């Protein structure tokens, strides 16, 4: 540990300008990418983020960094390369930097903006079910201090294996923008209104605008962070500014952890 | 008088020099000397993480060492 | 290698470079909408943008060539 | 209203939410505290903690329950306050249950966010 | 405390009426009974129905009263209809605080199997020098 002098008020009193600019980052548009190393180098002290595989599997950044002296792992879903989908090489990148910090007691803090799989014949050829059960054993293993920041999309199983509540995420926040949703509304609306909409093309309705609608409908009422906090999945919905300071006095809540597994030689992780 | 004093090991500063250089180092003295409200917290220590053996040395050594060390 | 290829089959929403200018690595290129976002494609190496052969709606596959620099 | 299909919208209303839960059964239940002269359960945890230290959790928190009508009536919060703050900059754990609510009684969600707070206190010591 | 200490195998056959904190006493599931099992005539309920009705449907039952009703035959009625939905096994069976409701002639089986399966257990608890028990 580095010694750094904490300053005094709650975090809504300590907030800077950097902080601030986090409150406008999100696009307005849900298929607008945002670069995640402007929240990376916002939360960590200094700016300054040694990142690891750089160049490999750019869908997700890993690396370390500080909070208030601390060594922390970050891993991060990418908006700007893949849309942020997990694939097969994304999760044995992070799921062996999740292994690493957790060997050596370090934190990790995970930033999620991730619609779901990368969709592939040859995903599925290249083992995408047993590959991508790295990351999620990973994180399960993991018994550092684990915090979870949701930026926009948290989908479905790629909403389990970033950092969810039961898998043992100890604190998870969420922005405004925040979606969590076992998909998007899309798929959603087609499976859940099928009979209407195959009733409205059996009448000639404008079926188009009726799915419109009820899509419209299903991102107002759910695609939100709204349901996820009403379970308790999420602890907090902040503002964006309030990210760095809660991340680092939740790091300093969680700083001794005691988590009782059962006793085994060693586990059997996805090979 | 056993104590290390500051040395002035060369030049010769008039009072209102030695006044000012010695108010200014005071000023960047380290703080408190020493962090004496520290307190021993044990909870979740890393060696209490490790699995050991039951056969294991490193229970002799490394865990109930570092419990009972003060 | 000098090419700047699809990296996912979408369709070319703008086209962000000219043929004959010059690009740096990071410049933008391309944006492809594919599974529901505007994706950049970005300039791999520093250069001339040359053989242009992108078009707004082209909706190109994975792997094709976007210039080369 | 800022549109909320914006960023800035959408943080204007995280906003709204929030001041939602300071009087969430309204602002004259918080009248007849006072009157009797009693803290808010919220008052009571910014009382005991140092000033500025309350971290909530699951603020947003709304019951599950169909029976006899209460699908109706769903209070912010369900009726207790959970967190963490410092005490003499110690860190501690807390709830505090709100008997504006139903009385204090405790529901699933209730329950489960004391629960929550134990199991927090619990894993950190 | 020490029901929720016991590390042992701990076993509940529910006969009849298990109301309110009682029922929390004597061996619920959260309280980490391994198996719960409860007789047809099991009543799981947080309080018998005359208190339940006597506070949910008060407020109707006080305007029949302001009506001029005879609310002593809208008591009756509202205790049946809640005795008959509401107090009996299938509530917490279906939220799996009973894992198996069973004719009563199946008990002696269900409690040997039952030990038989957690005769070999692993629970595990916080590290404590020793526990605080009320005295
Ligand atoms: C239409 O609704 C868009 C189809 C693509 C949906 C995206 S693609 C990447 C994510 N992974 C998945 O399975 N669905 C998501």
């Known amino acids: ?271 | 008088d056993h104590e290390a004093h500051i040395k002035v090991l060369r030049g010769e500063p008039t009072p209102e020099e030695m006044a000012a250089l010695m108010a200014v180092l005071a000023s960047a003295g380290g703080g408190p000397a020493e962090p004496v409200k520290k307190e021993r917290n044990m909870w979740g220590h890393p060696v209490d993480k490790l699995r050991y053996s039951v056969f294991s040395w490193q229970r002799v050594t490394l865990l109930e060492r570092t419990h009972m060390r003060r | 290698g000098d090419a700047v290829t699809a990296p996912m089959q979408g369709t070319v929403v703008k086209v962000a470079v000219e043929e004959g200018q010059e690009v740096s690595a990071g410049d933008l290129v391309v944006v492809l909408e594919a599974m529901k976002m505007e994706n950049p494609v970005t300039a791999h190496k520093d250069g001339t943008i040359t053989g242009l052969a992108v078009e707004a709606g082209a909706a190109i596959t994975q792997g094709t060539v976007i210039a080369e620099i | 209203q800022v549109d909320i299909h914006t960023t800035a919208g959408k943080l204007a209303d995280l906003k709204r939410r929030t001041e939602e839960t300071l009087h969430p059964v309204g602002e004259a239940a918080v009248d007849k505290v006072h009157a009797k002269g009693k803290l808010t359960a919220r008052e009571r945890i910014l009382a005991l903690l140092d000033e500025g230290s309350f971290v909530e959790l699951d603020a947003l928190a709304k019951h599950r329950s169909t029976n006899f009508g209460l699908e109706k009536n769903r209070p912010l919060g369900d009726g207790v306050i959970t967190g963490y703050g410092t005490i003499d900059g110690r860190d501690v754990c807390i709830f505090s249950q709100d008997a504006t609510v139903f009385g204090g009684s405790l529901g699933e969600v209730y329950g489960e966010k004391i629960v929550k707070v134990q199991e927090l206190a619990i894993k950190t010591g």
């Open chain 1, 1 to 271: 540990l580095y010694p750094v002098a904490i300053p005094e008020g709650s975090i809504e009193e300590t907030l800077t300008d950097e902080d601030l600019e986090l409150d406008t980052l999100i696009p307005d548009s849900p298929n607008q990418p945002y670069d995640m190393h402007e929240v990376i180098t916002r939360i960590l002290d200094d700016d300054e983020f040694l990142e690891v595989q750089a160049g490999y599997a750019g869908n997700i950044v890993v690396g370390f960094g500080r909070v208030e002296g601390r060594p922390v792992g970050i891993v991060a879903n990418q908006p700007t390369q893949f849309a942020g989908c997990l694939d097969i090489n994304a999760s044995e990148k992070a799921a062996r930097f999740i292994r690493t910090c957790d060997c050596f007691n370090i934190p990790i803090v995970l930033l999620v903006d991730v619609p779901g799989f990368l969709p592939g014949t040859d995903q599925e050829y290249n083992g995408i079910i047993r590959r991508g059960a790295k990351l999620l054993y990973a994180y399960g293993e993991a018994t550092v201090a684990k915090v979870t920041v949701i930026t926009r999309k948290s989908y479905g199983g790629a909403y389990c294996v970033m950092g969810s509540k039961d898998m043992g995420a100890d604190v998870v926040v969420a922005w405004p923008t925040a979606q969590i949703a076992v998909m998007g509304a899309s798929g959603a609306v087609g499976f859940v209104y099928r009979q209407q909409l195959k009733e409205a093309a059996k009448n000639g309705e404008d079926v188009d605008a009726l799915r419109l609608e009820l899509q419209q409908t299903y991102e107002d009422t759910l695609v939100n962070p709204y349901i996820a906090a009403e379970r308790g999945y999420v602890d907090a919905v902040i503002p964006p500014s309030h990210t760095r300071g809660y991340v680092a006095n939740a790091l300093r809540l969680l700083e001794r952890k005691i988590v009782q597994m059962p006793p085994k030689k060693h586990g059997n992780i996805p090979l």
